[PDB]
Scaffold this active site. Sequence first.
Site, PDB file in Angstrom:
ATOM      1  N   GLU A 172      -5.785   6.621   3.858  1.00 15.00           N
ATOM      2  CA  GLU A 172      -4.491   5.920   4.020  1.00 15.00           C
ATOM      3  C   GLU A 172      -3.368   6.933   4.249  1.00 15.00           C
ATOM      4  OE1 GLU A 172      -3.759   2.409   1.370  1.00 15.00           O
ATOM      5  OE2 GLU A 172      -5.599   3.141   0.399  1.00 15.00           O
ATOM      6  N   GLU A 179       1.728   6.369  -6.659  1.00 15.01           N
ATOM      7  CA  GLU A 179       0.268   6.218  -6.615  1.00 15.01           C
ATOM      8  C   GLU A 179      -0.086   6.210  -5.155  1.00 15.01           C
ATOM      9  OE1 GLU A 179      -3.035   3.311  -6.464  1.00 15.01           O
ATOM     10  OE2 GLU A 179      -2.779   5.314  -5.496  1.00 15.01           O
ATOM     11  N   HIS A 208     -11.500   1.196  -9.192  1.00 16.79           N
ATOM     12  CA  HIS A 208     -11.686   0.479  -7.930  1.00 16.79           C
ATOM     13  C   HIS A 208     -11.640   1.551  -6.823  1.00 16.79           C
ATOM     14  CE1 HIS A 208     -11.904  -2.619 -11.043  1.00 16.79           C
ATOM     15  NE2 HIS A 208     -11.280  -3.612 -10.410  1.00 16.79           N
ATOM     16  N   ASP A 240      -7.169  -2.922 -12.214  1.00 21.39           N
ATOM     17  CA  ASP A 240      -7.918  -1.692 -12.608  1.00 21.39           C
ATOM     18  C   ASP A 240      -7.192  -1.135 -13.847  1.00 21.39           C
ATOM     19  OD1 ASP A 240      -8.913   0.956 -12.872  1.00 21.39           O
ATOM     20  OD2 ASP A 240      -8.851   1.324 -10.697  1.00 21.39           O
TER      21      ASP A 240
HETATM   22  N1  LIG Z   1      -5.200   2.453  -2.195  1.00 20.10           N
HETATM   23  C1  LIG Z   1      -4.411   3.005  -3.162  1.00 20.10           C
HETATM   24  N2  LIG Z   1      -3.307   3.636  -3.044  1.00 20.10           N
HETATM   25  C2  LIG Z   1      -2.707   4.084  -1.811  1.00 20.10           C
HETATM   26  C3  LIG Z   1      -1.311   3.636  -1.839  1.00 20.10           C
HETATM   27  C4  LIG Z   1      -1.108   2.129  -2.017  1.00 20.10           C
HETATM   28  N3  LIG Z   1       0.293   1.733  -2.234  1.00 20.10           N
HETATM   29  C5  LIG Z   1       0.741   1.978  -3.606  1.00 20.10           C
HETATM   30  C6  LIG Z   1       1.399   0.781  -4.181  1.00 20.10           C
HETATM   31  N4  LIG Z   1       2.126   1.095  -5.410  1.00 20.10           N
HETATM   32  C7  LIG Z   1       1.793   0.436  -6.536  1.00 20.10           C
HETATM   33  O1  LIG Z   1       0.847  -0.384  -6.564  1.00 20.10           O
HETATM   34  N5  LIG Z   1       2.539   0.753  -7.611  1.00 20.10           N
HETATM   35  C8  LIG Z   1       2.360   0.078  -8.898  1.00 20.10           C
HETATM   36  C9  LIG Z   1       1.337   0.703  -9.813  1.00 20.10           C
HETATM   37  C10 LIG Z   1       0.916   2.012  -9.609  1.00 20.10           C
HETATM   38  C11 LIG Z   1       0.030   2.605 -10.479  1.00 20.10           C
HETATM   39  C12 LIG Z   1      -0.455   1.903 -11.576  1.00 20.10           C
HETATM   40  C13 LIG Z   1      -0.028   0.615 -11.794  1.00 20.10           C
HETATM   41  C14 LIG Z   1       0.841   0.007 -10.903  1.00 20.10           C
HETATM   42  C15 LIG Z   1       1.189   2.360  -1.283  1.00 20.10           C
HETATM   43  C16 LIG Z   1       2.479   1.577  -1.141  1.00 20.10           C
HETATM   44  O2  LIG Z   1       3.325   2.317  -0.252  1.00 20.10           O
HETATM   45  C17 LIG Z   1       3.922   1.450   0.673  1.00 20.10           C
HETATM   46  N6  LIG Z   1       4.281   2.271   1.813  1.00 20.10           N
HETATM   47  C18 LIG Z   1       3.427   2.706   2.793  1.00 20.10           C
HETATM   48  N7  LIG Z   1       3.915   3.667   3.543  1.00 20.10           N
HETATM   49  C19 LIG Z   1       5.187   3.873   3.030  1.00 20.10           C
HETATM   50  C20 LIG Z   1       6.231   4.754   3.396  1.00 20.10           C
HETATM   51  N8  LIG Z   1       6.138   5.676   4.372  1.00 20.10           N
HETATM   52  N9  LIG Z   1       7.384   4.678   2.707  1.00 20.10           N
HETATM   53  C21 LIG Z   1       7.493   3.777   1.725  1.00 20.10           C
HETATM   54  N10 LIG Z   1       6.587   2.887   1.302  1.00 20.10           N
HETATM   55  C22 LIG Z   1       5.441   2.998   1.981  1.00 20.10           C
HETATM   56  C23 LIG Z   1       2.877   0.349   0.893  1.00 20.10           C
HETATM   57  O3  LIG Z   1       3.554  -0.807   1.377  1.00 20.10           O
HETATM   58  C24 LIG Z   1       2.343   0.176  -0.531  1.00 20.10           C
HETATM   59  O4  LIG Z   1       3.108  -0.710  -1.328  1.00 20.10           O
HETATM   60  N11 LIG Z   1      -4.768   2.721  -4.360  1.00 20.10           N
HETATM   61  C25 LIG Z   1      -6.041   2.172  -4.382  1.00 20.10           C
HETATM   62  C26 LIG Z   1      -7.061   2.146  -3.412  1.00 20.10           C
HETATM   63  C27 LIG Z   1      -8.334   1.731  -3.770  1.00 20.10           C
HETATM   64  C28 LIG Z   1      -8.573   1.292  -5.072  1.00 20.10           C
HETATM   65  C29 LIG Z   1      -7.515   1.281  -5.984  1.00 20.10           C
HETATM   66 BR1  LIG Z   1      -7.672   0.356  -7.621  1.00 20.10          BR
HETATM   67  C30 LIG Z   1      -6.278   1.758  -5.673  1.00 20.10           C
END
Ligand SMILES: N=C(NCCCN(CCNC(=O)NCc1ccccc1)C[C@H]1O[C@@H](n2cnc3c(N)ncnc32)[C@H](O)[C@@H]1O)Nc1cccc(Br)c1
Lengths: 328, 328
Positions: B118, B109, B266, B17
């Site tokens: 989530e 993020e 997304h 994205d």
């Molecule tokens: N769904 C989304 N975000 C919600 C969070 C997802 N994720 C972000 C990943 N982070 C990244 O990509 N970072 C890189 C990035 C970010 C932004 C731009 C580019 C790259 C959450 C991350 O936390 C981790 N975790 C969970 N509970 C935790 C706890 N208690 N403590 C520590 N870690 C914990 C879990 O393993 C996971 O790795 N984004 C999304 C959804 C739909 C469409 C689109 Br496109 C995006």
Amino acid sequence: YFQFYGYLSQQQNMMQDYVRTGTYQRAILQNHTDFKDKIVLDVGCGSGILSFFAAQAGARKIYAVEASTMAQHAEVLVKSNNLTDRIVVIPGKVEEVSLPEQVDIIISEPMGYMLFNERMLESYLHAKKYLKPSGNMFPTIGDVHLAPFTDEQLYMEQFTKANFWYQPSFHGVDLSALRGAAVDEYFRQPVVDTFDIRILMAKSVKYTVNFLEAKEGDLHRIEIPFKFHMLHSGLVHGLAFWFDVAFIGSIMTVWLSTAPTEPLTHWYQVRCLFQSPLFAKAGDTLSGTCLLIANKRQSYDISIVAQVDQTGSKSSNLLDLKNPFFRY
Amino acid sequence: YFQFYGYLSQQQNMMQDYVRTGTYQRAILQNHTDFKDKIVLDVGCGSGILSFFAAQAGARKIYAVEASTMAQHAEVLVKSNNLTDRIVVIPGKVEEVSLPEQVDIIISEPMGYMLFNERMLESYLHAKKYLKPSGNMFPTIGDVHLAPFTDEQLYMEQFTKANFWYQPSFHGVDLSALRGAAVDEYFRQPVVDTFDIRILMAKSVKYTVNFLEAKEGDLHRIEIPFKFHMLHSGLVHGLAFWFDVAFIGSIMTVWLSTAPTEPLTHWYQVRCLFQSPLFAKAGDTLSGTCLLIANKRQSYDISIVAQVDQTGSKSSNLLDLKNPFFRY
Ligand SMILES: N=C(NCCCN(CCNC(=O)NCc1ccccc1)C[C@H]1O[C@@H](n2cnc3c(N)ncnc32)[C@H](O)[C@@H]1O)Nc1cccc(Br)c1
Ligand SMILES: N=C(NCCCN(CCNC(=O)NCc1ccccc1)C[C@H]1O[C@@H](n2cnc3c(N)ncnc32)[C@H](O)[C@@H]1O)Nc1cccc(Br)c1
């Protein structure tokens, strides 16, 4: 597993596989003398359709056990088709509930991808504690088929899908060091879809489970040795899996086949790639072992080992059936 | 949630994205004086990309906390981009781990569908125990937008999808008594996809969360009252949701918007149907309450209540965000 199955949209999706619904109805009703005036247990009944098929064949009493909230929907169908005397819906796990009576016949649809996925067969076998020595089960046996395939397009797709990770500057970040781990993760996903039989390089090996005799603990560790007689010369990229179940009635034996030579089902077929392909000549033998270990996630770890006896060239993989690639 | 996030194919899908990746890089690097020589916490770092963006802006030390096996992949990228002195990957939950030091700035993020899905925002807010009083968070605030829509095609689709259940003889079984429960289940699925703004019948209401001030427990129960001034005459079929987050830096404020007037992300947008639509005239007011209750499944129950003040005509729904319909 006891929430996903509570959805009518899921029951609707499964009931629309015409081979599945039609094969079950044919197996039961062609063998209707095996149900006439009998006592029936329906394990994981879902919407209740197999319980209705038992009733169509003249069963006396049908216990329909269902662990999900689909049970409430089943009791609505039983009341609306005027059958509350004959079909008794029992909400709960077949392991925990009580039946007032032993049964002549157990019916179920416990087959996941590659037959064993979802581990519902453990619940079907568990139910045999309710079965008379007289008793039958529908289905009666299951055959898993394995055969080696050649599919360079599918192999190469796994590399192509990871070539995102080649980027030396993704917004100033060098991703390249993870490309190998990404390839590796793609190779650990079993591929669910259908293929032309032209890709099979040898005739299938058959592994049979006799549900009348097998016990719950046989499915914790399933060992499938194989020796293939290669009918073609080329790269073998992995093994293809499918299954058949047989309804062995008094009157007739009915087969439900998920073989690539039969019409498509929503089971498709499953292919596991080797980490790297093996060259085999027509005439060579490809020998090894497929080991399925049951995991806490209600799925299996798949270990595959193969070597070509004539060269000693060897390949393996360890795949997670919890995480399939749905390529169809 | 701590297995799905361990897949590189998931990190790859999200990093592609371009609005998400580009907006985060722009927010951090346009505000680079806010990172220069500072201490940074990256909460749920995934592959680690935001930690690299902090390093690009001259941060001194970045703690990158990740609860999944993606952490092992992140330490591989940190070693291969020559940054082990500056980025410290810490495998574990941000609630349980130790940091040797308080930080100037938290980056993350944590936005799911409809922003809250989530429930990762609870972990982002929890991390503030590590933040100096001086300190900032990136992102800084989140706006959820709600607006009423008119979409007869989407409404009718819910009836059409259930018309399988009309069959009075599906292999001798009368399904019809379950048609209403099936309709009902479809209506309880939030619809994830994009739409043309031509469907909105009123200007959006904004509900703002200030992440600098909000506390973890504010997100257990989120109450969003609304009063809309209807700009069009017709059936209102439900509410549409989207969100914006603001990175409020010293130099600049950068917006990441998931609004239907902005390029597709997304995150798409989310629509919740009423069980039955409301007729409203241009000039009427549509008032009610959207209530989000956090559940054990790391998602929300969405209760919506609306009435047209001028007629007293009222509608509602209770939707499960754990079970979206991905219509795109
Ligand atoms: N769904 C989304 N975000 C919600 C969070 C997802 N994720 C972000 C990943 N982070 C990244 O990509 N970072 C890189 C990035 C970010 C932004 C731009 C580019 C790259 C959450 C991350 O936390 C981790 N975790 C969970 N509970 C935790 C706890 N208690 N403590 C520590 N870690 C914990 C879990 O393993 C996971 O790795 N984004 C999304 C959804 C739909 C469409 C689109 Br496109 C995006
Ligand atoms: N995945 C498949 N089968 C595995 C079993 C699914 N399901 C069969 C549903 N049953 C039906 O549809 N029956 C109707 C039917 C059957 C055959 C043809 C037509 C209609 C298992 C059912 O047991 C329930 N349950 C789980 N553990 C239980 C426990 N311990 N005790 C009691 N109930 C338990 C769980 O809630 C759920 O309701 N089939 C499948 C897969 C891929 C493609 C295709 Br197409 C088919």
